[PDB]
Every structure is written in C-alpha cells, then in structure tokens.
Amino acid sequence: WTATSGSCKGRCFELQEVGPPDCRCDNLCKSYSSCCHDFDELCLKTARGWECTKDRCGEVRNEENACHCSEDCLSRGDCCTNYQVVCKGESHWVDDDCEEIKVPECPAGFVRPPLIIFSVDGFRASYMKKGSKVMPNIEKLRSCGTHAPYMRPVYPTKTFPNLYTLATGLYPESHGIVGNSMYDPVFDASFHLRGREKFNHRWWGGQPLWITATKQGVRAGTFFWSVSIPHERRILTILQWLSLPDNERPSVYAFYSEQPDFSGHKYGPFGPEMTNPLREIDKTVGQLMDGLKQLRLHRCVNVIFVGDHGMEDVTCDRTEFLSNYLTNVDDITLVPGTLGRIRAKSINNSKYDPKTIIAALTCKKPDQHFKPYMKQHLPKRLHYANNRRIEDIHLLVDRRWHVARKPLDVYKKCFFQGDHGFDNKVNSMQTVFVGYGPTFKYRTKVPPFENIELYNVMCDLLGLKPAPNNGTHGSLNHLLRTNTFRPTMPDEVSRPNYPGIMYLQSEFDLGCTCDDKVENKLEELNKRLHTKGSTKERHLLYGRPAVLYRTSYDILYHTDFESGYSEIFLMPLWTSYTISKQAEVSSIPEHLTNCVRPDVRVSPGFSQNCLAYKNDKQMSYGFLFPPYLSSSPEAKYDAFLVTNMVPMYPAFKRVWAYFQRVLVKKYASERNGVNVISGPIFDYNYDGLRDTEDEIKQYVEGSSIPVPTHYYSIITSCLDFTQPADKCDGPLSVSSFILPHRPDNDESCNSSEDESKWVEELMKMHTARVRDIEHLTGLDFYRKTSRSYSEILTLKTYLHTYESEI
Template identity: 25%
Template sequence: MVTGLYPESHGIVDNSVFDLQLSSNLEKMRTKESDPYYGGEPIWSVYKRLTGRPAHCLFWVGCYHNNTGYKPDVSFDYNQSLSLDSRIETLLDWLRLPKETRPGLINAYLHQPDEAGHNQKSPKDVDDALAMVDEYMDKLFTAFHKENLLECINLVIVSDHGMQPLNRSVDISGHVKEDGLVVAKGVVTRIQINDTCEFEIENLAISASDLGKELYCTMKNVKVNTKESMPVRKHYSNSHRIGDFILEGRPGATFDIPFKGGDHGYDYHVENMHTIMFARGPAFKKNSVAPAFQNVQYMNLWLTLLGIEGALPNNGTVGFFDSILEKAPKRENKWESMGECDNFGSSQVLECQKIPAAEKNKLASKLSSCPLAKSFPVYSKDYCYQSYCENTVMANRDPDDCRKAVIEVLNAFSEKSFSDFSFLNTKYSIQCPFANHSSMVFFSAGSTSMSKMADAQFVFPAYFQRKILGPLQQKTQDYTTKYKKLYVISGLATDTNRDGHADQLAGSPTHFYRILIRCLDSWVSTNPPACKNNRMRSLAFIFPILDEHPTLECMDSNEILLDYTATISDVEQIAGFEFQLGSLSPAAPSYEWKGCENLGKCQLNGYDTPPLVILSFDGFAREYLDRKIVKSLDYLAECGAKAERVFPSFPSKTFPNHYTMVTGLYPESHGIVDNSVFDLQLSSELEKMRTKKGDPYYGGEPVDDALVMVDEYMDKLFTAFHKENLLECINLVIVSDHGMQPLNRSVDISGHVKEDGLIVVKGVVTRIHINDTSISASDVGKELYCTMENVKVNTKESMPVRKHYSNNHRIGDFILEGKPGATFDMPFDGGDHGYDYHVENMHTIMFARGPAFKKNSVAPAFQNVQYMNLWLTLLGIEDALPNNGTVGFFDSILKKAPKRVNRECDNFGSSQVLECQKMPAAEKNKLASKLSSCPLANSFPVYSKDYCYQSYCENTVIANRDPDDCRKAVIEVLNASSEKSSPAFSFLNTKYSIQCPFANHSSMAFFSAGSTCEWFLGGRELIKMEFSAMSKMADAQFVFPAYFQRSTVPRGAGIDI
C-alpha cells in the first residue's frame, strides 16, 4: 500500500521471509531488524526525497527501516498498548506543528480489528472490535473537526486484508519431509529447498521434481504451485524469496497446527480477504465511490494527493482514483491508435491448410469487402493490426517475434465452420507462418471460418491443451451461447523471468491470455466495443504454457479457470499492450465533524499542497462494513471517496501488505513475503518481521469491540481535524491490510511431510523451504500434492501469476493454501488472514477525503499494490518510482484520467486474404470480401506504445511494432450466431503483411478464441470444435506445448463473466 508494488516486487513476500542472501533462517518480518529485506521505495521516502518535507509515521510496517536513506522524521517503536487517546493526540500534535516542521505525510497503523479476527470465538467478537473501531474513528474525526482540520487534510482509511474464520488444519508433515526445506506455514504455505552451501539447484540433493511428487494432489483441496505455474494475477512469482512451492488450501483451512479462530493470506478471490478504503478531504469528491481495486493501486493515489504524481513507477495505475478526486492532475494524452500492419496487396485468402472451395470463396468475398475497424481498443507501438473483418490479428512489427493476439467478435448465431483449415489475409502476408500443420492448435475463440486465421495458431503442449485450452474454449463457447455476443481478445505473451511484464526481446511465448467482454444491456458497437449505458463486464485469464502442472489433476476445470483469472491490467503488463475497456460503477451511499458544508474550503495558511495522512487499520475486512458498526467511514465517504473493495496482495498477511501499500511492489518484489521470512543470505533462522521492540503484536480483544474502538478512534481523529480546520486541508486515506476469516479447522501437515531439514512457515498459507541438500523438492512434492483434502500446493513455478508470489527465494519451495476457514497452525483459535484474495473475507477497505479526491467517488476494486501510485500522486511526485501498480489507476476518484489513442499497424495495401494454410475457395472469398469491406474500429480498449493493431473486421490483432517480437494479441467478438468455419486454414490480411509469419504450420495452434480448435482427449480420441473463419488469423497462432492444449470438454456452471 505504501510502495505500489506487489510483494514479489518489494520483497516482503510473506510475514516470514527466507532469503539465503540475507539469512540462513526463515525470518519473521515483525521482529527482524534488517533493512535489506525491504525493497522498493515507500511513499515517505519518495516524498522526503523529492520535496524535502517532513513525513511522520505511527507504527506502519517498514517505517522503522531505512532501506533508501529517507526514513520518516518521526517513527515510534511499536507499542500496541499506546491508548487511542494518545494516538489521536499524537496525530493532532503533528498537524498542529508550524508549516516548516508539520508533516505533509502521515502513515498511521492500528492493530484492530485484526487482533479480534485472529482470536475470535464467535462473530460477536469481531462485532465488538468493529464497534471499538467506530468509537475510535468518531473520536479521531471529532478531534479533527474541533481543530478545524477535517476540511484541510486528505484522510484515507485503508485496511490490509480481511479475515477468514478457520475450521481445519492441513498437516503437510505426512506428505513431505522438512529436512533441507524451509517451510513457511500459514493459510498459504511456501516451501523452499534450502542449501546453506550451494545456491545452484542442480547441486541440491533435494530436487524440486521429487519434492513436487510429494506435494501435488497428495492433500485434499490443496493447490500446489511453483513460481512458473503461479497465476499471474497473484503477482507472486518474480522473487526468489517466494520459494519453490506455494501451497494453498480452501478458505477456512490453514497449514498451521494448531490454528486460531481466524486468519488471512488467502487468494483475493476469497471474499473474506477483501477489505476497505474510505477517504475524505479537499482532494476527494463528495459521496464518491471508487470501483473495486487491488491495494497495489494506493501508491499512485498517495503520489497524486501529495502533488508528486508519476514520481515513482509502480505496479498501480496512475489515475485509477481520478473518479473520486475533485481535481485529478492533467496528464498528457498518450493514447494512440494502433497502426495497421504493413500491406502487401489486396485482401485475399492465403490457404495455410487446405480450405474447401466453397468456404474459401466465402472467406475471400468477406475479406475483400469488410472495412477496417473505425477505431481500436488496443495500443502498442511494437504491434500493428491485421484486419480479418470482424476479427483482428495483432502482430508484432518484428517478423521474428511470434507473439500475436487475436480480437474476435463471437456471435451465438453465426454460421459455424466444420472444415479443418487455416488461412491468412494476403493483405498482410503472402507466406503462411507454419509448415507443420498437424501440431498446430488454434487459440482463436470463434467457430466461424474467419476465426481460422493461421496467425491464431500455436503448438501448445498436449497437457496444456487437455487441462487448460480445451476447457477455456468450451467455456468461451458456453458464454457465447449464454450471452449471445462476446468480444474476445486472445494472445501469446513472453515473460521468461515471471515478473508479470512482457519481455523486451523476442522469445518463445511463455503465457497465453484471453479477455472475454460482454454487455449487461445491449451492444452499441463491437467496433469499437461499446455497451448501452456503459455497462460492460469482462473476464480475463492468463495461463503459463507448461508441459505439465500436476496439481491441476486434482482440480476440476472450473476451479482451474477461476484460479488463472487475471485483471485487465495483468494482461496489459504481460502482453505489452494498453487496453481502453470498461468503466467505473458509481454508487451512492451524528458525528460532530460529519457533513460537507466546508468541503474544499481550507481555512489554514500554508496548506497549498495538502499533507497526506494515510491511516491503516490492521485486518479491517471489507465484510465488516456490512455490520454497520463503523459509521465514521460512511460519513467520511459522503464528502470523499471510497473503494468498492480492495484486494490484498498474496498472501494477505500484515507485513507483506503494509509494505506493498507504501512501495507499490508485490511481496515477491519488496521481499517481505510473509510475516515471518526465511532468507539464508540474511539469517539461518525463520525471522518474524514484527519489530522486536514493544509489546506483543496481538492481544485478545474481540472483533466487534475492536470495530467500536476503531470508529471511536476515527471519530476522535476527524473531530480533532475538524476543530483544527485541517479536515479540508489534508488528504486523508484510510486503508486496511487484509480481512479476517473465522477458522474452523486445522490441516496437519506433519502426517504428510517430515519437517526435519525443512523450514515451515505455518499459517493459513504455509511456506516450506527445503533447508537440507539431501532433501529433494520432488520428494517433498510427492508428500504434499493432493495428499491433504482441500489443500492447494504450489511451487513458485506453478504459483498463479495473479498472486505475484514466485519471484523471490524467500517465498520458499512449496506454498500450501487451504480453503477459507482452514489453517495449518495447530491448535487454531478465532480467525486469521493470509488467504488468496479470491477469498472475499480477505478483501479490505479504502476510504479517502481531501482536496485531491472527488466527492462521493468510488474506486473500482483493486489490489493494494496500486496504493503507491496514489501516494505518489497525492504527494505531487507521480511517476517518481516504478512499482507494480498502475499509474493512473485511481484517476476515477481523482480529477482527470488520461486519454490514449491506438495506432493502426503500418499498411502495405488493401485488405485481401493471404493464405497461410490452404483454405477452401469459398471460405477465402468470404473472408476476402469481408476484409475488404469491414471498417476500422472507432476506438480500442487496449493501449501500448510498443504495439499497433491490425483490423480483421470484428476481430483485431495487436502486433508489436518490432518485427522481431512475435508477441501478439487477438481481440475477438464471439457470437453464437456467427457463421462458423470447419476447414483447417489460417490467413493474414494483406493490408498489414504479405508474408505469413510461420513456416512450420503443423506445430501451430490458434490462440484466437473464435478459431477452430482441435485436441486429443486421453491422447487418442480427436475432439474438434468449429469456430469463426475470421478468427483464423495466422498471427493468432503459436506453438503451444501439447500439455497446454490437452483437455476434456467441460460443461456446467463455474466462473462467469
């Protein structure tokens, strides 16, 4: 929240971190006094470095570390026993200081209602804590009000995570021997193979392969990922601290034995992990609501509120909170139209796989007549687009770069094609991309002839086809039938170091992504995509292209697809595009200080740049708002902004998330990968990240009492601000680090894996580090995978990218996650956090008020890595420090969001069909006719300065402007009624290329959603699906591993758009 970085980026990948470069032990971040663990630059450092102004800190994670040379001017040792009144008076004293010494930024942390959530015996415990929180906030706001501060400061209230009641423990000890491993346990468990002498994995007696065998599918309901297999959305791969395996159980499960009442750390998909954000101040609009967001977005809000927007790059989006800000910074309009690819002639059909004559004639006719898109929702300077009528191939301008994307419009009523062929549009290419047709699989989603673009193919591993691509294609078709029309973008991305960002240099694609878009009401346009009343919904996926991922064998297809969902921002980062999609959803919604009569009327001198006050409530779950105990936040939001919900970074633990909020880095990046960290380079022990000074971190007060105290504190604080005339002069942001999940069971890993030689960090996520060279990861994995009910076991390689929990050696070798309510601690009591942010109880909060925020604005749901860019924006140093957040993410709650324009790829002639795999003449004629007549997209929901777009009518290819970069993306509109194509072919639009991208046709598979897809079921039975011919763009193909392509055909409910 204070860095804008995912944990994988700022390094605090958990509350406990193992980093052999810093320590030979798993170090607990709450007690470890070592600056090197903390990566990235927190907001107070950026602010002091760029402005020279004071910044003060009250107990915020990381404040007592000086890893950048700019430590807060005032930062107390942690003292949980400090009374609420004393805390309020401290904040007031700071804001009463003369202008020269008064802090322009204040970060304050409160331990409730987290403590109550962990120790809860019943929901009433949490309710009591919430009542206490409300009492605290009322006292705080009353104090602000009496001091006339309420209208002079920007106040943002956040939380780090939610809380999930625990109900079971998963014991990994019976599955894996912990000798030679570092195991960080909790609701997510990280296992790292540890060798204190050698760092090369090949020298270790414990192999990841053997350890994986002990983990994969050995524990019921436990997902086991490596950093390679980790969903991109988790942003938990790009840190050596994450470990080799990441284990996740279902909500309620923990790997700690025994376990307490509640815990956090689960996937942010768990609703109990969701948290809050409320804000008030001269920067915030009255009664504004920010859409749901992940807390990595906060950093850009802080930067904006502090007048230093853009001062530090991070993982958040600059401008995300503009919708809740009164005056968002003016930004240069960087949006450019993606250019059309070079044209080599007219649009004709080039057969890349033999096309039946009738089908070819249809395609040719369509290609030659369909107009270019009017505008294009995707931008990249490195890519251009090739028009395939309703489909578009986005091709890299570098001919050696095989990354491509396909845009398709799928229609439930389109005529399906049953022919097996692929083709190209000769406007863009006169050479088919692949020679070996038999191994290629379409990744386009459509079932018409036009989706059988040769560029929408790739050679996926058979396992990938069976477990991922097949179910995804079926799910896409099910959605097309259900919603009648879809706009689909499918593409290939290369991210060899798993940092979530597209590689600069061309390489073999490592990931496959898809975005599905539908309208809640009706479609206004599919070219560009636009919905009536701007009511658009999207669902995105990013899948690592792996030859195998054993933990998927104990997950059903819907569970797999859900796990590998991603945000649009995640796809942008890994694809190298910028999208222009979607809109924010507005929402409407005593204490002495409440009311907006003085909004924007700061009556104090010297507050031209409002100080930024960031107040965090530990463990304030989004769900707690529904209890209606903490009224202060509702009153605050009436005059400011709040977030729909905030997703904690994975794992949803206190230390990783607080440091994420002030660095904009994922824990894998900032190094605090857990509350306890094992890093052999720093310590041979598992170190607690909690400071060694002060009283115990957790006490035993019930949650509802804590909420009452929080409200009391906030009321006192805001009243004091109001009395000091500060309320309209500061930007106040209230956040939380995580939610809270009541615990109901414990998962005992001791019966699955022996802990000798392992460092096991237990909790609702458990991390296992192998700390003995004689123990192999493969052997440990065998003891863990699918051996514990409802426990996911991951390595850093298999960890979902969305968790961003792979790229740090401190994470460990295995990460174990149980279902919400489960913990790996034994015994357990109350509640805990740390679950995946998919667990709703982990969701948290963000509220804000101040001169930077729009009144009554709502930020969409976001992950807390976004905060850093908010801090930078609020402090006037936006873009000052790169981080994992998205610059501009908070634009919707601030003032003015940037506009971007896509560029069409270079044109080389008219739109004709270039056959890249032989197509039937009729199909070719149809495509050619359609290509030559379909218009360009009016606007385009994708942006990247490195890419351009190629129009394929309802589909679009987003291509890299570097011809050597093969990364491409495809946007498709899938329509169940669209005319379907059956022959196998691929083609290009000659407007952008006169040369087909691949020579080896047989190994290519379409990744466009509307293309023909064929794969083997059980290695023998050939399954075929028919899709749109316009989706068979040659640029929408890739050589996917067979594992990636292979799958059964799933049906039924699961995830939805």
C-alpha cells in the same frame, strides 16, 4: 550502545531522529531500547485519563496530566479530544449532520489539506455492514465521504506485505516484503516479525509515501507506532503535530491500530468478543475527528480509513501435514500457515528434488486443502514470483485451512480461531476503504479496487509525483473531487504493415496440406472487401491495440476476425473477433480436420510450418480465431491459415478447445454478444512483463517458432446487456484470463473427467485484469472508444473474481 543519559524534556515525539549513542525521544525508540530515561515520565503521561470531565473545566494547567482541560489548552494544542464538548457545550463530530465539503476550509498558513491515514489491521470488508450499529463514527465517514464496498489486498494477505504495498504502490515481489517471514539467499540472512533484522534497510525496496513526501519538500509525521504506545496517545501526538508552526508541521500523518486483527486471531472474524474492539476503534476515530473539529481542521483534512486485509475462520484441526505426503519430511524447510513456501534444508544436499516433492503433493487426497505450485505457475494475478525471497515451491492453501510440516509443529510451537494470508481473491480477506475530506467526493460509492492503486492517489492528495509503481495512475480519478491526474494514452511505437497478396501457393514448402481446392463476381468482389477490412468495424470494436515496443508486424483482415501478426514471433500478438448472441457453433468438417493453409499475404520465411509440429512429439497446435465459430463454410477456410496457428501442448488443447467450442458461445448468450481478443504471452523469467525474443527458453523442435508460457483472452461486452456488444452506447464490461500453457493438467485434480467439470474452474482461477495482459504483451487496448480515458483505466484494472457477494 546507547548512552541514555540525555533528556526528552521538550523533545517528546520529535520528528527528526538523532544519531546514537545519543538517547532518542521519537515514537520508534521503544523498539530500539534507546529512549531517554525520562521518556515514559514526560512523553507517556497517563494521569487523569483521556477525557475531560465536568469538574475539570477551566482548571489550572497541571503538566502531569495526559491531556488538559485548562483554558490555554487550545493554544498549546493539547486538550483532551472531548474538551470542547464538555467545557464549551460543543457537539461531537458524529452528532453533526454531514455537509458537503466543496473546498478545503483550512486555518491561515496551511499550504495544502493535510492527509491522515487511519489504518486498521484485520478490518474485514463485511465489518462495515455487519458492525455498523456499533461504529457510528466510521459509518458517518463511510456514508458522507467516498467509499468502496471493499478493497482488494495483495497476496499474501499478511500485514507487512500489505502495509508496505499501501505505502509504495508495489507488489510484494517488487518491494521485497514477500511474507511476514523471509530468507534472502544472497544476503544469507533471515527476516522475522519478532527480532531486530527486520529494521535493516536492505529488506525494504521501492519508495514509501513518507520518503516520497520528504524528498519533494512535504513533511511527514512518522508512520511506525510502537505497540506499547496507547491509541489515545497516538491520536494526541498527531493532534499536537497539527498544532505546530507552519514551517515545522507535517502534511501527511499515519495512525495504526493492531485491532481488530489481534482479537480476530483469538476469536475468529465474527466471534462475540469482536464487538468490543470494533467499538474501541470507532471511539478512536471519534476522538480524532473531535480533535480535528477542535482545531477547525475537520473540513480541511483528508482522512483515509483503510485496512490491510480481512480475517477468516481457521482452527488447529484444519491443518494439513506435509508428513502425510512426504517420506523425506526432514530434508525441507517449510514457511507454514495460510500459505506454504518450501526450500531444501541444506544446499549441500544434492538428493533434494523439487520435481519429486511437487509430485508427492499433487492431488494425493480426495479433499486435499492445498495445491502445490512451482512459483512461475501461480496465477499471474497474484504477481508472486519475481523475487529471490520467494521459494520455487509454493502451496496455495484453501481458505479456512493451515499447512504445517509435522503435527509436532502445531501442538509444540487449540489456540487460534482466525487467520489471514490466503489468495487475495477470497471474500474473507477483503478489506476496507473510505476517503473523507475536501479532495474526496461527497456521498459517493466507487467500485472495488486494488490497494496497489492507493499510493498514486495519496501522491495526488499531497501534490506529489509518485515514484514508479504498479498502480495505474488515473484509474482512481473517480474517487476525487479535484486533484485528478490527467493521463495520456501511451504512444504507439510500432506501426503495422498492411500486406496484400504477394506470394503464390507454390512458394511455400511448409509440409502443410488442406483439402480446399474447390471454387462469379458475386462471391469474389465480396471476398476482396473482407481481406481489405470491410467487416473490421464489427470485429475490432475498440480500435486496434497499440504496440508499445519496437517490432515488425502485419494487420491481417478476414470476414470473421482481424489479427496483428508478428513477423518476429511468427504468430499473432492479438486476434480480435466478435460473436453475437445469434451466432451459431458449427463443427470442423471431417475433410478439414488437419487442414493448414499458407497465407499468401505473408512470406514463407515469416510463417510457421507443419513439419516442425510433426517432428515435435511433445507439441501440437491450435488456432486463435476458433474454426467452430466461422460465420460460413467459406469463411471457415480463413480460420485454417498458417497465420492463425499457435503452438499448443495436447494437454492444453483440451482447455483451449472447450473455451472456444463451448464457453465463447455461452458468454455471447449470457452477455448479448462478446468481443474476444486472444493471443500468446511469453514470460519465461516470470517478471510479469513481455519477454524479448532473446528470453525465450523453448521452441517448437527444429524451428524458430517460440512456445508461449500463457494464452490470454479479453472478453468485452456492453455493461447495459440489453444492448448488443457490437452496438453499445455506454460503459463496457470485461472479463479476462491468462491461462498457463502447460504440458499437463496436473493443476486440475478432476482433469481426467469431462472438460465441463474442470475447465471453467481453471479459467476462473486464472482470471486477470486487462492491465496484467498489457504488462505481459506490451500492447495497449481500448484505444478508440467513446469513453473517457479514466473510465477506461478503471475498466483495465477490473478483475472478475468469481466469488459470491460480500
């Protein structure tokens, strides 16, 4: 109940929320049906429109007007945004040349430049160029401030997951808003767009910017605007808030536009009807900037123009129906659309089997426009698994398509021409970023980055300490003129051992054999130096990774590669090697096909053994430094050391072998040498973070040899590819992947064909940031380069997406 008998007199858009049943006057009351009787009358005035006209100038203050052109309006802070242009001969902000804002130019009593976030729903990245003619205000912001060609949203590329990611710096899996629709089995409760349950605090995890500000004494305008409140009114309210007394005035503000998303759903991303909503957004930006200029705040405030996601073409006829695949269609609940989430309709149904559901959806039709996954097998880059609200079964839907349960669900629930929600690597889903203000750089283009990074920066902009989040703090320092955050490299927790030769061949009983018994200080003084690390400068280019957790490991040196070998996990945590453009691919000699050799630097008790692999009918093995890339017949024997061995399903060996035999050389050719760091990943609880030994759910049979869930590689070269990887004088270029270590190739529908038709495509799907690999391994890469740490942080957040140009 709300006793709405009180009044909004003088309380219009009050910054503090009074406790019911007292009537409210804040910009959220509409969505609660708790506004005072007079809210519309007093707080939502519309009389006379939004602009001053020539004959309104100098008028007598008439309180019924939506905004004012009277003389006292500046002091009252409630002029129409175009007042000075019409009545005082001022020019529009857009018509002014831009001038570098070297320092905040703020009125007395402003303790810090305010931050205004102007967020636009469905603003596809390519609108910046494609709509440039009809958006002069946005275009000045863009070219005069700091801009990226695009900003990468989070998966799923829906509104609430993305806006809440912007506000928290967290992946949906951590903030909890994992879709526009959700079921939480622990609450036994459902979250919906329409409805009231979504206003319950328990859905919303992490700590959004407005709470971070508030707890640290920085006042915030409210972020959520009711749909019925017109854009012009939202602008004037922000401007009014900015005219408040120093002690009452917020420092951070948000504006939100439902457009161009709203129109985009109806008309498609480039429907002719899209021009108008883009003009209108630009007009709103103009009004904000004119209002700021009126208040002498246009060289004081930092403005962020940011979208949540793009928009793709999607029509009713491009819909896959689960009823064309499943006989048991009525025993499942589907969260439908641009992604699919499946669970059992009833928990009392013990005949529901996810395994057989997945099988029935796997490569069943030639051009099938969705792919089923168990959530832990989704590409790690999506970070979409560690939350009880994410169903075990997931469908990644092809761009331009929908998935639905039954045809009736489509024609009884074509309407739409656009939608979004797809994989966050899809060009059509990319959105925008522009920063303009004293704290951002002048006329600067920055590389694309992820929206998870913005929280940190908005914290920097407001002098706040960010709550723990998924951004990498410092990776966006190159956006900022000042207020940079100077991060320091994490301290190494474990130091390596450096074992020499300590064991005789005969101390090993591993059931391994090798045809290697063939024999001179020419080639023996030489091989000593290689095992002490004489070629280490070539194969270990950026210093050894640091181990950021407590463990026992050995640095092992070799002619062709260096490794950090875990005595705990019985394999390298990392294997580093350099392949020059000139390097040659050889095959494995017939006599050495099954060759595995004990490593005399490492005890039998800390080694794998061949027997376990013989007994395990499911599990074979591969090597991290590839035998094919050995520098010499003699060097090749090193690649067969038991300490270079890792467990691999035969199905995965097809993938790995093609990577090592074909792709590494190809990348070396194309990139002028590559440095490769490869290794295992263990993430059995799919939390994106390195497993402790007690979290491993699978071993090679009859052994303590743990089975990785994934294999990674980080592939680094010179950004200036006219320089070789091993002699680079400037910025680096990287591409990485985290390949799932699976017993089958069910994910690849073409896998019965040659590796040259499917493997690289799989790898591309599982592209990763070095930073993702850091979370998963507890290692820290690039410790010793000539590059600034901030640039390295940027490099570590880079994702090679394999899409076309935007």
